[PDB]
Ligand binder design. Structure first.
Ligand SMILES: C[S@@+](CC[C@H](N)C(=O)[O-])C[C@H]1O[C@@H](n2cnc3c(N)ncnc32)[C@H](O)[C@@H]1O
Ligand SMILES: C[S@@+](CC[C@H](N)C(=O)[O-])C[C@H]1O[C@@H](n2cnc3c(N)ncnc32)[C@H](O)[C@@H]1O
Ligand SMILES: Cc1cccc2c(C(=O)O)c(O)ccc12
Ligand SMILES: Cc1cccc2c(C(=O)O)c(O)ccc12
Lengths: 325, 325
């Protein structure tokens, strides 16, 4: 990151200003015709002088434009803040979304680096999953988010592997079914089931029902720490292991080992170290999880009686295939 | 400008990682021969694996280096983290210092933008000054920091203005007397008074006493919201006004107007808008403060019965000389 000055490199004013902008939808208000601080503030329900001061800072940062009359506009860059923008980044920074909220837990990083425990609880007084499990709205935003992460990192994962051969795929921690839906849409004789908590499971169900996939896709509300529906061709763990510490990760893999038996395949699909150090710190502060390497996944697999037998990179992530030892 | 991608621009992991490193003294432990994650963690009292993950992130950021054997080293950049470094930036980021702690209040920026009220309270349950007023240690770090900001921005402020002609200057909110001490050292027949709260004032006193200046420099514990020692040639407000909202800033200027009467001069010394946006948002989040322009100061001065007569820029800061209307 060049040579800014340690103080500027540790600046919180700017990223927080962006996050607040995202949350106030300032960009969308600007496009809808509100351009002065007074108008924008009224539209967003913010303090005029304070909002104006925030905008002046973001103008400097390079997201907004401001003319002598006090009329603000967006820049090529500031366009990415619009809620309708193609990259859909605004929702990730919105302090109301699960991740826009979770990231503020970074303000407690010290506790994580000191104890190895997650920081999120220090800030919100409860674990991440517990927090979602009791706030359906919050949980829904998280589902939408993980759904978006799929379009972003798993484009065409359907062809990058022989899914059809599996016959039946169990998506352990499958969220709202975005991935399973994708697999089944590309392989018409394939069937599967999403195993997750109440929130995502019900969402997965709504999706399959509305999409005309209920004939091949089913959901099951359960904890992947307990026995899984057994006998399927393959068990998928998409963005799930890095959310857990080593001990819980093997517990999970262990359950997939058993469900898969001697004829099943366990497929860990996530950002393998090699997926930056930023995401790794997020896993640490959120759940005390971590981004792992193929070697590190190999170790976990060994403890669960599995072995890596393949690892296919597919854009941002990789599909590491494990089978009974 | 400074484009990287919206989520990257709103990143909290890096600035927080830098702050945690500063707080843990990683740079200094390394210079002292501790180069592996295990050693540094042991010396700093951090979780080994976690500290290692923080360091890996920071070598990526560009502050550290790592050899294949797990030995960390600083970089031309990571040198700035050393406490003995010349720029003295580390203490500003230490989560234990007043400003390293206050900045974390930025996670509550939204509250400020929404209400115009300081964010610090939202995070720490009390105002900044109340916080220092009840924690002498915390308050001492702040004094040291403000003292360091004098060397950085006020270099040669003694010659940039005709202080000597003042005879006796009252430094309202003069902290630990660093400025007054520099003025009196450059002007032998000059005398002055530091008016501040117990903490800073006692430190100013200790300073004057120890540097052989008690003969010309005196301290007075008090609030600049109440009457001030009257009849001095000049009253200085150094980095004070931008710590308050309009109402308070005017109140403060009144007390100076009254004290200076028709023969004294009020000297507001701070970074006038046009330091920038970064400091402005910090003032907002710390105490609902505000960086002001020469025009805006002039407006305040008017309400206090004063008028701007001059404005000498000196490095980062400017000296706004005000006089009774
Ligand atoms: C990274 S998220 C989404 C993963 C999903 N496969 C995807 O890539 O969109 C992790 C998933 O694990 C689910 N989960 C968390 N704890 C669980 C548990 N104990 N049992 C089953 N699912 C759980 C969360 O609800 C979430 O849906
Ligand atoms: C930003 S510091 C500046 C210190 C010094 N003038 C300098 O420039 O380094 C603000 C000063 O205002 C002092 N202060 C805060 N509230 C005060 C009050 N009500 N009455 C007098 N001084 C106060 C603080 O203790 C602190 O010393
Ligand atoms: C909390 C959380 C869980 C899983 C994934 C993510 C991702 C992701 O997979 O990209 C994020 O970018 C941010 C937070 C995440
Ligand atoms: C809280 C606070 C009060 C006064 C000044 C500062 C400065 C300064 O004058 O440079 C900072 O950089 C950061 C915080 C400050």
């Amino acid at each position: 990151a060049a040579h800014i000055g340690l103080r500027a490199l540790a600046d919180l004013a700017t990223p927080m200003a962006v996050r607040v902008a995202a949350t106030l939808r300032v960009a969308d208000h600007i496009a809808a015709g509100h351009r002065t601080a007074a108008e924008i503030a009224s539209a967003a329900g913010a303090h005029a002088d304070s909002l104006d001061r925030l905008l002046r800072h973001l103008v400097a940062v390079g997201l907004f434009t401001r003319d002598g009359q006090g009329v603000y506009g967006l820049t090529e860059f500031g366009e990415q803040l619009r809620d309708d923008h193609a990259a859909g980044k605004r929702k990730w920074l919105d302090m109301n979304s699960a991740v826009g909220r979770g990231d503020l837990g970074f303000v407690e990083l010290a506790h994580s680096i000191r104890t190895g425990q997650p920081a999120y609880p220090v800030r919100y007084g409860t674990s991440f999953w517990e927090d979602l499990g009791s706030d359906p709205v919050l949980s829904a935003s998280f589902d939408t988010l993980m759904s978006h992460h799929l379009e972003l990192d798993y484009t065409g994962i359907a062809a990058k592997y022989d899914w059809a051969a599996l016959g039946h795929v169990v998506d352990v921690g499958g969220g709202s079914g975005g991935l399973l839906s994708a697999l089944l849409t590309a392989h018409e004789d394939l069937s599967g089931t999403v195993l997750d908590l109440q929130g995502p499971a019900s969402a997965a169900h709504r999706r399959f029902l509305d999409t005309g996939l209920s004939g091949r896709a089913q959901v099951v509300v359960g904890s992947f720490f307990d026995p899984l529906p057994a006998g399927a061709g393959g068990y998928v763990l998409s963005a799930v292991l890095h959310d857990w510490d080593d001990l819980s990760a093997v517990a999970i893999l262990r359950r997939c080992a058993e469900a898969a038996g001697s004829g099943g395949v366990v497929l860990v699909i996530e950002a393998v170290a090699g997926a930056g150090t930023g995401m790794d710190l997020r896993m640490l502060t959120y759940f005390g999880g971590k981004e792992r390497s193929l070697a590190e996944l190999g170790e976990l697999a060994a403890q669960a009686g599995l072995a890596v037998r393949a690892a296919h990179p597919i854009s941002y992530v990789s599909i590491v295939e494990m089978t009974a030892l």
